[PDB]
Write a protein that binds this ligand. Structure first.
Ligand code: RET
Ligand code: RET
Ligand code: RET
Ligand code: RET
Ligand code: RET
Ligand code: LFA
Ligand code: LFA
Ligand code: LFA
Ligand code: LFA
Ligand code: LFA
Ligand code: LFA
Ligand code: LFA
Ligand code: LFA
Ligand code: LFA
Ligand code: LFA
Ligand code: LFA
Ligand code: LFA
Ligand code: LFA
Ligand code: LFA
Ligand code: LFA
Ligand code: LFA
Ligand code: LFA
Ligand code: LFA
Ligand code: LFA
Ligand code: LFA
Ligand code: LFA
Ligand code: LFA
Ligand code: LFA
Ligand code: LFA
Ligand code: LFA
Ligand code: LFA
Ligand code: LFA
Lengths: 235, 235, 235, 235, 235
């Protein structure tokens, strides 16, 4: 009776594909109902989800056919979608306040180091140790920016209550949620190893929570700020 | 001559895929004609149907190829779409009245227990008995909320005639319509068993009625309330 | 040289798929240019065509692979799209006048008896004779409604010239156009029999005319009424 | 290493598919920026291109698999898309002037005779000679209409400079551009014959020019007229 | 461990497909937020990305199946997408200033010579030398136009700060970014030769940067000019 991990692997790939195409359409359709200052935020949110959905459509095909789906495949999605998620901190701030363009590049370059540093270590192009180290340095920058950098100070000075809640929530996703992936990398590569079937499940589930909760956090910020403005217009 | 159950299984998978993509596009296109307070209701309705349509597209492929479509596959759709349907009670109330956000989480957690409780019992991760029990407890919460809870009291105090009709109708779907699935689980798992082909037909037909009637109930509420408002504007 | 019927079967399946996806997009894109009272009419028109297009996409796959496409497959499309076409008489009337909701259910139930009555006779679940009889009773109701029923009286009392033209045109499609299908059923089932290849061609061609002419009749009504109103606004 | 015609055949099928899906989206997205009188013109333009794109998607599949793509397959696209292109002369005139609806039917029937006349001769259902003759008679009508008929006189009396340019340009496409297809038919059927690999290239390239140049001619007319009106509003 | 080039080839085809469908949807959805004078610029930007995404969808299929993806396949995409990118210089200028239509044709013909000149040399229809020479002449025209031609003079006289930034940025892409492709051609054909696997990677990466950076440059111009206008309206 007990379903085999292999069964759960290709099931979760379907789940992820459906959930993310759903979230995508939902965020792209509700982009017309947020104040216009939030339109790019909502367009980037829906397109992030669409990109990830297309990844899972590709991967489910590779699983159905070949029966294998390596973990290095992820760095295609991540190179795209981690980048877009870290940029969301800038896009959200520009919605409500004025921030230097430099924040955009610090954040993006920080994401690119995290993913590329780990890819090089996973693909074999360099020691997985040096892969981990470069990846963690990339992360700790991003965290450094959003906790004690221009992004954090810009948040405080915005005065936007929506942007306060967004930041507090996205920062928590990027700190706890995103800590699964490094862990995975460590155990799989620098450690004993994990069956790829089992690591495909964990990554599939973590993606469900680190992409949906991210999306809903940002969507509530856009919807709450939109309403706040309408309520102040009424007064 | 007599078509074989196997024939009717893969036919109904097509029916369900066509009907649900049709209902999806219809609810997403008519979302621009309802009062704006009903836009999220209509966006969630169309995206629920799209998610289910994508499921049936996946499953029809598995059937066409392998010739088998297990009943545990359903919990991918259900984990997504049951959740969204139970949340519709909150989304509808927030359209017309003021309701605690806590209701959102009581309802969602209630759905997650129902589906996950049954998945664990169907996958083999726990006795199907304990699966049933946990599933039914999850349901009876949801029913408890919408019959004698904050959702029910908020409905009464809304004063919205549309929200009255919606509730009365959705409550009936969730009580009678949704009682097929537990029944299935009982007979298939805790009972003698069903032949999977037969249970795929029943579930395919029940999905047609528990997703279309749900959608049309909610669509009529949004369309009726929209008009009510226009008629009071004219006065 | 002479193309074989088998060649024309899979060709016509492509034709139908293209024509119906084309008509679908055209009716869904032109729904924004008709008076808003015609928006549901145009949304149902485009979604009817989309549902049929998806059917033909499925069937062309079955043909390309298996080389066979049974005639009982049609009742998937028909159960959906015949229902929607018979309801169009109600949706059009509610665009321009006030009609009882009962008409909706008389019409829908009439369609469901027609298709289901014939499915049961085609699938083998009952004598094809009793299938025919139940199917024809279902049709003759629908005709009875639209010729000498509430639908007919509501048309006369609407005073809408567009709704007069629509009715006259749709009632002619439902009387002459739709008489091919019963004929087919009779000859194939109650009669000697028809090669499925030949009957797939006839049904493919009849669908092209009974779905396009239907769509264009309804689209002209919506476009003509829209303009009539603008011309009276100018005066 | 000179690429083989077979290589160029399936390459050009891809080209055509991409170009036509691109033109389709472009015309359907720019339909919102033309004066509303041009909305049906632009909706028919985009849907013509979409229909042809879907054809080429089907055909590329047949090529990739079977390695053969007969030239009689074209008459599926042509029956749809030639009809729509000849009707564009009516749709454009009704945008800017008042024209009898009879022109619509003369033009459509003229197209249907051209394609069907040639199909019957290509499929084998009648002498290719009689196929050619019936096809050319159908064409020469259409040319007769647009050069010396109601379409030509309506153009002159419109006074629309955009409709003058469109007509002059579409007339040239229908006279020179469309003369490739008859030629092909003659050489392939009434003449010696052409390898279907070579005739698929010529037809693929001619479709690229007789569908893109057609589209851009019509799009410039809609965009030029839109602006002309805005410039006269400013004065 | 070290991933094989073959692995990276089909991975990058996925990346490119996802990134370009993402950029496409993003540019087509943000088309509604730029000043209307920028709507064609944004529609051409999104459709360029879509055309390239569809190419990579085709090519990934050819790789997955056949295991080979020749470098001559590229000229299908390039004939379309290079053309559209060189025309963007005209479309952008017409957004903000008055420019002769002749520039459109000089630019387009210049692109067509570049790609076709190289195709003829790659396909074998003429010496790769003469292919290179004709290709480089085509390029050097385009550069000549945009550096010291009507396009450059029109830019200077526009007075638009957005169009200044766009031009300077696109000119840099067309000069440095686009210099990789000629290099490839030279080394592969006129030179020693390169494994197609390696050249597929380089071209895949260069496309990611020469199509995204192009798109973001143009999008910033449209977004910056839109805002500049709003800011001057406020004053
Ligand atoms: C939607 C997918 C997401 C958010 C994935 C997140 C990925 C990371 C945070 C990866 C981090 C890594 C390190 C910090 C160490 C080196 C290995 C990585 C790339 C897995
Ligand atoms: C659109 C699909 C729907 C609404 C499915 C509904 C599913 C349920 C109501 C499932 C309920 C179950 C129990 C109450 C007991 C345990 C077994 C379940 C999960 C089938
Ligand atoms: C778009 C497809 C259409 C309109 C199909 C129409 C189908 C019918 C009118 C079927 C009628 C039948 C009878 C009246 C008796 C025998 C059984 C049927 C279902 C073929
Ligand atoms: C987009 C495709 C187009 C415009 C195809 C055009 C087709 C024709 C003009 C066909 C004409 C023919 C004749 C005039 C003679 C008989 C053979 C035909 C059908 C090829
Ligand atoms: C999005 C794809 C792009 C921008 C591709 C650019 C292609 C070129 C600039 C090709 C140029 C060539 C030459 C200048 C010499 C001959 C060979 C070519 C076609 C590769
Ligand atoms: C409650 C959500 C559970 C999602 C996990 C995956 C469930 C699907 C299991 C599919 C097994 C199919 C067996 C194929 C052989
Ligand atoms: C000034 C107002 C805010 C505008 C922000 C624009 C954000 C657009 C989306 C950014 C996408 C980032 C790149 C993601 C892909 C990975 C990196 C590719 C380039 C090297
Ligand atoms: C100011 C920041 C503009 C960012 C534009 C998007 C960049 C995408 C990646 C390169
Ligand atoms: C043997 C494994 C050693 C892993 C060391 C990782 C150190 C991370 C430092 C990041 C800054
Ligand atoms: C409280 C209302 C907003 C809920 C957003 C989260 C949606 C569920 C995913 C967790
Ligand atoms: C007023 C104009 C209304 C335009 C509405 C268009 C959006 C509704 C349709 C979205 C359908 C998305 C389907 C995506 C399928 C992905 C698989
Ligand atoms: C006030 C409006 C809040 C709108 C929320 C709409 C989206 C709710 C989605 C909840 C369920 C998604 C599936 C979660 C699975 C765990
Ligand atoms: C029974 C679970 C209730 C969880 C939600 C608690 C209140 C959250 C308000 C935000
Ligand atoms: C909690 C409601 C369900 C109780 C019965 C569980 C199934 C018992 C099977 C013996
Ligand atoms: C003008 C009438 C168009 C109907 C086309 C009928 C189908 C033609 C397809 C033939 C396929 C040939 C395969 C051998
Ligand atoms: C401003 C007007 C914009 C109208 C755009 C929406 C028109 C309807 C498009 C529906 C497309 C559905 C395509 C099929 C999706 C599932 C397969
Ligand atoms: C003013 C009263 C309401 C007028 C508009 C009603 C709109 C109904 C549009 C949807 C009709 C769907 C009915 C056909 C469903 C097809 C499948 C039925 C299978 C049982
Ligand atoms: C008169 C309003 C009727 C609304 C019906 C909505 C569509 C029902 C679909 C089948 C049940
Ligand atoms: C709505 C339901 C329509 C059912 C039509 C078929 C009835 C068949 C009765 C057979 C009795 C032997
Ligand atoms: C009247 C609605 C019937 C819906 C189910 C139809 C199933 C048709 C299956 C045919 C299979 C052929 C092999
Ligand atoms: C009207 C009733 C339908 C016709 C039935 C005629 C008898 C059928 C068997 C030949
Ligand atoms: C505009 C598209 C140009 C395509 C040229 C294709 C040439 C193929 C020659 C084959 C012999
Ligand atoms: C199996 C090898 C396939 C190579 C096909 C190359 C086809 C390219 C056709 C290009 C037409 C446009 C050139 C400019
Ligand atoms: C406010 C402007 C919104 C414009 C939206 C236009 C969307 C319609 C154009 C895309 C239609 C594509 C249909 C593809 C169907 C494939 C099957
Ligand atoms: C004021 C009147 C304006 C009328 C506009 C009519 C628009 C018609 C658009 C659709 C034309 C379809 C032409 C036929 C398509 C192919 C079907 C014929 C048999 C192959
Ligand atoms: C006056 C013409 C109105 C449009 C009719 C559309 C006809 C489509 C094919 C029959
Ligand atoms: C509408 C297509 C016209 C076809 C006419 C066919 C005439 C054939 C006459 C001799 C056999
Ligand atoms: C209507 C004009 C017909 C021209 C072709 C005549 C037949 C040529 C056969 C040799
Ligand atoms: C860091 C950005 C990603 C670069 C491309 C990644 C390609 C990984 C593909 C691996 C496929 C393994 C098959 C065995
Ligand atoms: C063979 C290559 C085919 C594609 C090349 C052409 C693609 C771009 C054409 C569409 C955009 C033209 C828009 C013109 C806008 C300005 C018109 C001048 C008056 C303002
Ligand atoms: C200024 C005139 C622009 C016309 C664009 C036509 C494009 C034709 C396809 C290359
Ligand atoms: C200046 C145009 C480019 C000339 C290329 C010369 C190539 C010489 C043979 C390698």
């Amino acid at each position: 009776s007990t379903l085999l991990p292999t069964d759960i692997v290709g099931g979760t790939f379907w789940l992820l594909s459906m959930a993310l195409i759903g979230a995508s359409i939902f965020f792209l359709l509700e982009r017309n109902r947020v104040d216009g200052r939030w339109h790019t935020t909502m367009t980037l949110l829906g397109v992030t989800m669409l990109i990830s959905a297309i990844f899972y459509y590709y991967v489910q095909g590779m699983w159905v056919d070949t029966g294998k789906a390596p973990i290095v495949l992820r760095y295609l999605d991540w190179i795209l979608t981690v980048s877009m998620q870290v940029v969301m901190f800038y896009v959200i701030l520009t919605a409500v306040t004025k921030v230097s363009s430099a924040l955009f590049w610090r954040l993006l370059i920080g994401a690119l180091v995290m993913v590329i540093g780990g890819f090089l270590g996973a693909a074999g192009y360099m020691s997985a140790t040096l892969g981990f180290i470069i990846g963690v340095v990339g992360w700790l920058y991003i965290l450094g920016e959003i906790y004690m950098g221009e992004a954090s100070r810009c948040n405080i000075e915005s005065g936007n209550e929506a942007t306060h809640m967004a930041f507090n929530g996205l920062r928590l996703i990027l700190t706890i949620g995103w800590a699964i992936y490094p862990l995975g990398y460590f155990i799989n590569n620098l450690g004993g190893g994990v069956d790829a079937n089992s690591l495909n499940i964990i990554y599939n589930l973590t993606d469900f929570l680190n992409k949906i909760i991210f999306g809903f956090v940002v969507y509530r910020a856009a919807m709450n700020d939109t309403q706040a403005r309408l309520d102040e217009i009424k007064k």
